[model samples]
Target: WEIDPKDLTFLKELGTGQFGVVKYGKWRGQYDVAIKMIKEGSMSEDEFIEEAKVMMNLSHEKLVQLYGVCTKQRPIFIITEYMANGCLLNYLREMRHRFQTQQLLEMCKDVCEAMEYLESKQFLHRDLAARNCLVNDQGVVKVSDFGLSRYVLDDEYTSSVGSKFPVRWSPPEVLMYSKFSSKSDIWAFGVLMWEIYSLGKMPYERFTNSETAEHIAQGLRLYRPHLASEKVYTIMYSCWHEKADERPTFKILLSNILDVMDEE
Candidate 1:
C-alpha cells in the first residue's frame, strides 16, 4: 500500500484484459516490473483495497509476486514482477514442439503446488486456466490473474460472470450452482493440462457454452490429446468427476504428476 509514484515509470503497454492494460515498467528506475493499471470506474475502492490486502499477504515462487500498489492515483497500478514470456497458452502454442510431455507435466506440477499453497491459505482462485498463468525467464510457470480470487471459508464460496469464465474449463457445479472451491479449480486444472497437451487448443472448440455444459452434465469429457499418454489422461479424467468431493486435492495431484515424471 506504499504510494511511490515518483519511483516508478510505465514504459509501454504490454497486454490488456477486461480490467485494464498491463504495462512494462521499472520501479525505482532499476527494478523490472509489470504495472497492472486497473481502468477507472471498473471497480470500487473497497474491492481494490481488499484485493491488495490479500495479495500482500501471499508469497510463493509459483505465484506471481506483487511488489506494491499505487491506489492513491487514478487508474490504480498494481506493481508485480514482470513475466518475460507472458501467458502460458501462447507460450505453449508458439513452442509446441519445443516442449516434451515430461516438461509439460512439470509445468502442471508447478501450478498444482501453487494451488495447494493457496488452498492452505483458504483462498479460492475462481479463475484458473492456462491463459491466466505466466512464465518468466528460465521457463518457470507461475499462476497469475488474481482479479477474481478471494479468501473463502468452509472450502467453498458460492459466487457468481461472462466469456471471462472460460466455460469450457469450468466444472458442472460451478456453472450450475455458482459454488466454487479447490475442487472446481482442480477441474479447471484438468482442462489446463489438456491445453498444454493440445498445444493450447480451445476446449470443446466446436461446441457453444450451453452445449459444452450440457455435454459435461451428461458425462462427456475432453478427449485425450495426441501428446498425452494414457496415464496423464487418466489423471485429467479423475478431476472431471461428477462429484466435487471425489476429485483429488492439489497435494495428491502434485504427487501423482511427480510420480509420473519419476517413472520417465
Candidate 2:
C-alpha cells in the first residue's frame, strides 16, 4: 500500500458542492491534477462506479478529461486534468476589471462553441451556469462539469420539483417543473451571458427563487446592467425572452455573438 494521499500535498480547494471536494493537487515527482475526493461513506460503491464509467467514456477537447479513477481503496479518489484557474464563476468575479465588451465577447465565443460541440455529443449539461464554463489566463473558457448531465431531455414535459437544484442562470421553465430540453439549455446560456456582463452577479440575484418564478410568470427579465454596452444588453434581452421556443439555439447564439450584427 502507498503512504497518505496528503503526502503529495493539496494546493487548494478548487471548489465544493453536492457531490465532493474538487481540488488542485501536486506531487513532488510527477504532474499536477484535479482531485475530487469522495469522503468515506459519502457515496455508495455502485454510484461511484457509475460516475467513473460515465465520465471516463466522455471525450471532448473543450471539456475536462477524467484521466483516471482510484477506487481500489477507501476514500476513493477521482483524478483529472487540473484547472488552476478555477470555475468560470470565480474567474468572472475575480477578473471583472480586466474585461471590456470586446473581451467578454471573445470569451463567450469559446463558451458557445464548446456548447455546440458538447450538445452534438448527445449530453445535456444540466447545470449550465457561469461557474460551469471554465476560464483560464488566456481569456478562454472550456465547458465542463458533467456531474449534472444526463441523456438530453427528450420532448417529454412535466412540472414539479422533487430533484430540484437551484441555478440562478436557469430559465423559469426549468424551475417550474417542466422538462429541461436542449433548447431550454440555450436559454440558460443567455443567462450565462448576463453573468459575464455583470462580472458574476447572477441573472436574478435581486429576486428570491420563488420570486424569480413569479416575475418570469409576469414576463419580467433581468435587464442588462448599466455598465453593459447597448449591443451586449440587446443580445441578453433576446436570450431571456419569456417563451423558450423564441430563444436561440447555441448555433444561432454563436452567430449572434460573433457575427457583424449592427446592434448585436
Candidate 3:
C-alpha cells in the first residue's frame, strides 16, 4: 500500500540507525506505527523498494508487518508495526537480570517461528541478528528488517563481489564465497540465540572480522553461554556446522526449540 506523507502524524523518535531515524507515529490518524525514514545515500533505494515489494506479500504473527511506503517524498517512509519494547538487542541488554532461562528460550522460539515461515516461503534473511529483531509490549519478539532479505526462486542466492555482509553472524560459506541461503540465516539464528542467552553480548567480541572469518574456517564456534543448558547449546551448535548442508532447517530448529521448551 502507498501511504500519503500528510496522513502520517509523527509523535516522537523511536530509534535511529544506519538506515535513518525511526519515529513513533500514527497512520491516517488511526493506527499507531513505526515510520522508518531512510537516510539519503545510506543504502540502495531501488533494492530496498524491491525488497519491500516482496515483504508486502508476506505476513505472519511472528513477523513485523509492513503497513505501507511513501516513495514520492524525500527521506522515504517505510511504515511498519510498532513495538513498544523496541529493539531486542537493547531490551535484552537492559533487562539482562530480569529474564529467566525459560523466558530466554521463548524469545528464541519466537524468532525460530518467524524464520521457519520465511524459510518455507523461500526467503533468505541475509542479516539475521538480535539487532534486527524487535520486542513488543507483551515481550513477544518478532523478526524485522527485510532490508537484507531476498526471495529466492531457487534454494540460494549468491552475492556479487564488493557486496557487504555481517561477518560475525555469518557462516564460512557466506564469509568466503558470498553464498546466501536459508542455511546462512540459521547460522545467524544460532548467534542470535547466543545473544539472547548472553544478554546481547557481541559475538566474536575478541576477534576482528578477518580473524573471525579465519577462526570460523578453522572450526571455531561460539562457546556455550552460562544461561543455556546443554540441550539448548546442542541446538545452537547444530546450526554452526561447517558445511551448510549439515545445518538443520528452520523448520527442524523450530521443532527442536518447541521440544526443549515443552520439556522445561
Report the number of the highest-lDDT candidate: 3
TM-score for each prediction?
0.89, 0.80, 0.88
Candidate 1, residue 160: how far the Cα is off, in Å? 11
Candidates sorted by lDDT, descending order?
3, 1, 2
The 10 consecutive residues of candidate 2 with the worst lDDT sum are 151-160
RMSD of each: 4.5, 5.2, 4.6
Per-residue lDDT of 132 in model 1: 81
Q: Candidate 2 at residue 135, lDDT? A: 62
Q: Which candidate, 1 or 3, has the higher lDDT?
A: 3
Compare the candidates by TM-score and give the number of the best one.
1
lDDT of each: 0.80, 0.68, 0.85
Model 1: ten consecutive residues of lowest lDDT: 151-160
lDDT of 2 at 172: 68
Worst 10-residue stretch by lDDT in candidate 3? Answer: 151-160
Give the residue spans of candidate 2 off by over 4 A.
1-12, 27-30, 95-97, 149-167, 260-264
Superposition error at 85 for model 1 (Å): 0.8
